[PDB]
Amino acid sequence: TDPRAKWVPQDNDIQACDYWRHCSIDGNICDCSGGSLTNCPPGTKLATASWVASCYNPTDGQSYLIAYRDCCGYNVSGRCPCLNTEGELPVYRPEFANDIIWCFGAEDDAMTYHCTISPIVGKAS
Amino acid sequence: TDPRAKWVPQDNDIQACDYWRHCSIDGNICDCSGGSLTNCPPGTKLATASWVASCYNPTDGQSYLIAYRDCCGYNVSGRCPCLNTEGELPVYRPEFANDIIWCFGAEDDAMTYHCTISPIVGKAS
Amino acid sequence: DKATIPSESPFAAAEVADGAIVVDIAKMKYETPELHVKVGDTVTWINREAMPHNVHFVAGVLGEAALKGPMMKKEQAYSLTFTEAGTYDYHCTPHPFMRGKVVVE
Amino acid sequence: DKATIPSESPFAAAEVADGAIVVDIAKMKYETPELHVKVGDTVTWINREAMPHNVHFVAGVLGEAALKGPMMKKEQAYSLTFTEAGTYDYHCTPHPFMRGKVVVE
Amino acid sequence: APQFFNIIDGSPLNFDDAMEEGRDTEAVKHFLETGENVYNEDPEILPEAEELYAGMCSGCHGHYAEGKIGPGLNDAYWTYPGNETDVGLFSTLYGGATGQMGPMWGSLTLDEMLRTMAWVRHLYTGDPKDASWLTDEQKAGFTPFQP
Amino acid sequence: APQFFNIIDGSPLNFDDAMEEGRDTEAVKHFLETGENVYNEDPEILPEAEELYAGMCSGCHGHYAEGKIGPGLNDAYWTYPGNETDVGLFSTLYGGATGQMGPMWGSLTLDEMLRTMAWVRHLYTGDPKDASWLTDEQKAGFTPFQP
Amino acid sequence: EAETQAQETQGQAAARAAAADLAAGQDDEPRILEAPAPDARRVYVNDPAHAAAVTQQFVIDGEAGRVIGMIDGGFLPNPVVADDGSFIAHASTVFSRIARGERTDYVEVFDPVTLLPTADIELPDAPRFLVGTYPWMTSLTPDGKTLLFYQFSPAPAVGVVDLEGKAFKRMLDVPDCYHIFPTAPDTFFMHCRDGSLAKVAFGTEGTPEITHTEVFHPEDEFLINHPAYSQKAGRLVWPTYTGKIHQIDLSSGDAKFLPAVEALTEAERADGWRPGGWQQVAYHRALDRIYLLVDQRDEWRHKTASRFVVVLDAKTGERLAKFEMGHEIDSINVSQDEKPLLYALSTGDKTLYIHDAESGEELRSVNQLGHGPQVITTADMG
Amino acid sequence: EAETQAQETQGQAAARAAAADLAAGQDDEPRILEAPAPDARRVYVNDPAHAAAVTQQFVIDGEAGRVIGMIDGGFLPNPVVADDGSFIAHASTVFSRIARGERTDYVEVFDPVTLLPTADIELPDAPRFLVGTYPWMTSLTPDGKTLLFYQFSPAPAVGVVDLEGKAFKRMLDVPDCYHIFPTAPDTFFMHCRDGSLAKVAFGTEGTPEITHTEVFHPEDEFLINHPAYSQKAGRLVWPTYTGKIHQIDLSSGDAKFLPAVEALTEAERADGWRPGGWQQVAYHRALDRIYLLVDQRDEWRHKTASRFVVVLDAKTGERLAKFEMGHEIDSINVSQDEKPLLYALSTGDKTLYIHDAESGEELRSVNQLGHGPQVITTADMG
Ligand code: HEC
Ligand code: HEC
Ligand SMILES: [Cu+2]
Ligand SMILES: [Cu+2]
Ligand code: NA
Ligand code: NA
C-alpha cells in the first residue's frame, strides 16, 4: 500500500494498522503481546496519562476520542508496529503529540515503552 | 544460495560470509563495525582466548589455523552476520566450539559480544 | 499531611453533593484557577470534556510526596480535603500548561 | 606476590637457554603436569603446537589478583619466577581441562 | 417570545422585581420579544459594557473573564448549558445561580444587564463560527479575544 | 654401528658402567649393531616391559607416561628430538638427561632397557604412521595406546 | 507487513467484540490482564537475539497461536519451566552501562499467570557460562526447589541456587563435564570430555560425591549441544552429527544405556541426509517417540536449518513418519499431551510454526518473534 | 549476504592486503584500532530502535561510506556532537533490570578517536524527557563546556550539565516552551506553546532571566519537531506542515525574524506536495541553502517517508533544485564543507544513502544501521 495516501480506517481487524481506533497510534498494538484492544499485557504497567486523537469510526459514522495510554516497564514488544498521525500535532501541543512516551502514572513509575492501547474515552467532533 | 551446500571459500572479499578465514566464525565480521580483518573496532576490548578452526585458503592451497577472538564490551554490532562451522565441535570440545562467547582475557573483563576477528595463528593440517 | 483523599479513584459527577465546592475542567483548563477555601473544606474537580485530565501537586506541597491524582474522564470527579492553611499549586500531568491554585484561608 | 614476571609478553622459544626449567605444551596438555622447582627458579612454558595456549592462575594463588597469562602461539614462550615456596595450580584459559601445578620448595 | 426561567429551579423570572429605570430601552424591548441582544458587538456600547464588567464582574470572573476566584466565562463551556444563548445568559444574571452568584435584578437594570452581557460575549476566545449568539454579519466581523 | 652419546654433554656413553648381566642377549647385540630394538611391539615381551616401566618410570613420568614430575613420553613431541629414534631413546636412559633424570645403568641391564623402551614406544598415542621407530608389520599391528 | 492466518482470526474477534461493546454503550476501562492458566499447549520461545545485550521470551498459547505474554531478559539468559506450571524462571546477566560496566548475574522467578517476578536472586562473582543457549546448561531439580547452572571458566562447576529459600547456595567443583540433567533433589548427571557420563550427588555442604559411567561413545562421534531430556521419564536422548541416537535411562538413579538407534535410514545417510539446526531433537514421553530435524547437507553444515522432521519409535527405532515442514526450521519441540503439537521454530523467519504431531500438517503460526528466536520450552504437566 | 558497492570495494581491498601480507610473510597481531580523526565528511547515525531499551549510534566516514565505529546507548538517548570535533556525547537512560527497576539518567562524553568514555555524569531524579529523538531537546552551548537537556514533567525545565567540571549543575525553571537553541555560554532560545520564542539567560545561580519575542506564527500553523539550527551562523530554520519556512536570525543575540519563505511552489502545493519524514530539514551554512524532504501526500501523513528533496536559497527563497532520491527517505542532513554531501537516511531500509548535494546523485550507501535509524548528525568544523 501507499504510505503517503490518505488514511482509510476499517473496523474488522484490530491487529492491522488501519484499524479505526489506531488513527493516531505510535508504537505497537498491545493486543499483539498479550494485552487486548484496551488492556495491558501481563507484567506491564498501565499508564494513566496519554496523548489523544479524534478517530472516525466507519461503522457508525461517529468520531470518538481515543486515549493512547501506554503499557510500560517492558522493552518494545516488537510485534505489530504502527504509526499513524491523524490530527497529530507537534510537541508544543503535547495533548496531541505522539512521539512522547505516554507512561506517566504507570505503577512503579515504569517509563519504558512496551505497547499502546486504543480505548475510547468519549465522543468527539 | 543453498545454506546446506558444502562451504566454498573465496579470497576476494572479507565482508562476505564465504571469505576463507571465516570458515568457522560465529557472530559478526569486525571489519563491518570499525575494526579490520584482524583488529577490534575503537572502544571495544580484545579477548586473548578463543575457539579455533583449520581453514583452507583456495589461493595457496594451504590450510591455516584461525583464532576466532572476540571484540567485547559492546552490544552485537548487527552488521555482517555470519555463521560457519567447518570442523566445529560440540561444547565438550571447547577448543573448537563456536557458540561460546570468546571474550576471556579482554581488558576490563568485558564479556559482551560485539564481533569476531579472523587472524591466522599458524599453519594447519 | 496537608490534605486527605476522600476517594482514591475518580467517581461519577452525579455523586457530587449539590452545593459542594467545585472546580470544573474544560477547554484545556481549570475554569476556576484561583479557588479560595477555608481550612477543612473539600474541593472537587469535575472534568466536563472528553480530553482526560487530573490534578498533580509536586512533592512538598500537600506533603512529603507529590500527589499524582488519577485521570478523570468526562463527567468524573476527584476530591481533596485541605487540612492546613496555605496556597497549593497544581497542574495536569500530561498537560503541564494547565495550571491551578487552591488558596486555603 | 608469590612470583615475578620476566616478560609481560610472549617471546621466541629459541631464546630459552639450554638447561632452563621448561614445561612444554603440546597435544592439548602441559607435558609436565607436576613440576617441582626450588624457591627462586624461573619456569618457562613453551607452546609447541599451532593451538594457542597460556597459563592461568586464579586470584589468590600467586597474589591478590589472578594471573591471566598471555596466549602463546606456536614456538612462543612465557616465564614466571617463583619467589615463595608452596603449590600453585594453573590451567589454560580457553581449555579449562588443561591443568598443571608448580611445586616450589 | 422566549422562555425566561430561573436557571436553577425552573420557575418563571418575575420581571415585576426589575428596577423601573432601564426597562424601556429599545434593546430591552427587542430582547424580551425576540431573545436577541442588539448590544452584541455594538461599538457605541462596548466601552461602557467594559466598565460595567470591570466593577461588577472582574473581581470574581477575571480581568478578561478568563476566570479567577470564580469560573471562566470566555469559552464554549458553560456549567449551565443555556448560557450559550443570550436568553439563558440573561436568565442567569436576573435570577442568579448558586453560591455568591445570586440574582442581580436588584443591582442592575434590564438594559445594564444586556450591555454587560455584550462585553462577556466580546471576551469570547472560541471560534466565531461557534458564536451562536451572533448574526452572520457579526460573526463575519468577530475576532477571538486577546488582551 | 650407531654412535652412542650422552644427550646433554655429548660425551660417549661408558658401557663399562653397564651391569654385567644382560649384555649378551641377541636383542642387545642387534640393537648395538643396527640401532634397532627388536622388542618393539613384541607381545612376549610387553608384560615384563610394562612391569619394568612401572617400577622405574611411572613414579616420575606417570602410569601411562602421560607425564607427571617428568615430561610425558607418549606423544609426538620430544624435548630432545633424537628420542624419536631408539638409539636416541636408549642414549637418554643409559646416560640420563638433566634434573632428576639420571643414568639408568645402575637399575636396568642393557636388555631390560630395550624392554622398557619397548613399553614406552607402546604407550605412544599418536597415529601409527608417525611411529618412525616402528616397522610396517609393527605399524599395521600397532594401535594408538588407550588405557 | 504481514498477519498470520491465525492473527487475522484474533484481530477480527477483538474488532467484533469491541464493536459490540461500543454498540451496547459499554465503556472502555483499561486494566492489566492476567495470562490464561498454563496448560499442556502453552509454549515458550526464547529469543537470544543473536547475542544482543537484551533479550525477550514469548509466552504462547499453542492452541490458538496467540502471544499471551512476554518476559524481558539480559545477555544470553538460560530459561527454565516448572513441569507443573507453578512457575518459570531464568538465569540472566545485565551490565551497568548496556554491554559495558559492572556485571550482575542473577536468577529470576516469575508467576506464570501475572508474569510478575517473585524472586531476584543474585549470583556472586558472575559465575554464569556465557554461551549460545543450551536448555540443559541451567536446570531445575525434580522437586522444582533448586536451580543448577553451569560454570565454564576458570574451572568447571555448577552453581546451586535455592529457589524455595530464594538464595544462592554454593558452587560445586565438577570434572571437565558439561550440561546438567537433574534426576533427584540432590543428584544430576553431566556429559564429560572423555565420552563418559558423570553422576554428581551433592549435600548441603562438603565435597560432592562424583562417579563416572562407562564411556558410551567414540571420540570421533560428536554429540550435539541440544539433547532432549525428559526428567519425568528420566530419558536422555542424545543424537550425533549423523543422526545416530544414544539413549540413556536415568530413572533408576543410575545410568542405564539403551541400544543405540539410527534416526536416519541407510538410504538417507547414503544420499547425504544428516540432522541440522539448533534444537534438533524432541522427545514425547507418553508416546515414547523421537523427533529429529533433518535434511540433505554437507557434514559441516550442522547448525543450518532443516526442512524435514523424521519421527521414530524410541524403543524399536522404527521409522514412523517423515514430515516436509515447508519452511527453514532451526528448532523443534512437542507438547506432552495425548495428541501433541509439533513445534517448528525458524530463526530466519522469526516465526513459530505449529503443526499436528501425528500428521505433520501445519495448523497455524506466530511471527515477529524477536530478532533470532531459537529455544522452544514446554511443560510436561499432569 | 547483501553488500553495498562501497563495502564491497572495502571488503575487496581488505582481502587484497591480507592476501599480500600473508604472501609476503607478515604475521597477524590483533590490536584495538582508533577511528580516523574526525572531519567534515564524518557523519553520525543514531538508532532509537523504535524505543527499545538499548540503542546504537553508528560513526561513519561519509567520503568512503564506511562504518568507522559505534557507541552504545540506553533508552531514547539524545546525541550531541561538538562542531570542532573535539568530542561527542549523549544523554542516556538505563534500568537495573532491562526496562524495569531503578532508572538512571546520565550523560556520557566520548573521545572522538578512541570512542572511550571520558565522562559519566549522573543526572539527579531521572529528569530526562523520554520522547522520540529530537536533536534540539539536548544541546551544547557554543563553547562546548555545557550540555542542556529538556524536562517535560512535572514542569517545563532545562537541566544544566557542566561538561568541563563533569558535573550536573541545576534545573532551570522555564515557561511552557520546548527545544533548546544555545546562542551563548549562558543563553538559549526555546519555542513556546503561544507561538513565541523564549530567550533564557542563566547564571551560575539565581532565577534565570526570561523574555519573550513577538508571536511569530499563527495557532493553526504547525512547526515540526525537527527544525534545523546552525549555531555557528545563528540561523534557525523552522518548517511547517505545508513547507512554509520560518527563519529566525539569532546571530545578534536577539531574535530577528526573517521573511517567510515557501519551500514548495504554488503549483506543487496545489498538487498535494507537502514535507514529510523525521528530520525533514537541513541547512548548509556557507552556501546558505535549505534542504527539505517533500512528496505528494495527505495532510495527516506528515511522518511518512519522502522520495524528493528540494533545495532553495535561504535568502531569496528561490528554488535551486529538486532531487528524486530514489528511496523512501525519512531524514536528511548535509556536511558543512565546500562541496557538501547530502545524507538521506531510510528508517525502513535501515540504510544511509550518501548523495552529492549539488547534483543530487547517489554516490554510495551504508546498510544494516540498526533496527530503525532516525537521526543524522554532523559537525560544522573549521
Ligand atoms: C463573585 C462575588 C462574583 C461576581 C462579582 C460575579 N460572579 Fe458570576 N459567578 C460567580 C460564581 C461563584 C459562579 C459559579 C456559580 C454556579 O452556581 O456554578 C458564577 C457564575 C456565573 C455564570 C455561569 C457560567 C456558566 O458556567 O454557565 C455567569 C454567566 C456569570 N457568573 C456572570 C456574571 C456576570 C455577568 C457578572 C458581573 C455582573 C458576574 N458573574 C459577577 C461569582 C461571581
Ligand atoms: C624421576 C626421578 C624420574 C624417573 C624415575 C625417570 N625419569 Fe625420565 N625424566 C625425568 C625428568 C625430570 C626429565 C626431564 C629432563 C630434561 O632434561 O628435561 C625426564 C626425561 C625423560 C626423557 C626425555 C623425553 C623428551 O621429551 O626428550 C625420557 C625419554 C625419559 N625421561 C625416560 C625415562 C624412562 C624410560 C624411565 C624409567 C626407566 C624414566 N625416565 C624414569 C625424571 C625421571
Ligand atoms: Cu489535562
Ligand atoms: Cu590451551
Ligand atoms: Na467557560
Ligand atoms: Na611428550
Coordinates of C-alpha atoms and ligand atoms in Angstrom, one line a residue, chain C residues 29 31, chain E residues 71-79, ligand 5:
Chain C
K29 CA -8.1 24.5 31.6
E31 CA -12.2 27.0 34.8
Chain E
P71 CA -15.2 30.4 36.9
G72 CA -14.2 31.4 33.4
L73 CA -16.8 32.9 31.0
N74 CA -14.7 33.4 27.9
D75 CA -15.2 30.0 26.2
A76 CA -17.7 27.5 24.8
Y77 CA -18.1 25.6 28.1
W78 CA -20.9 26.6 30.4
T79 CA -21.8 24.9 33.6
Ligands
NA5 NA -16.4 28.8 30.4

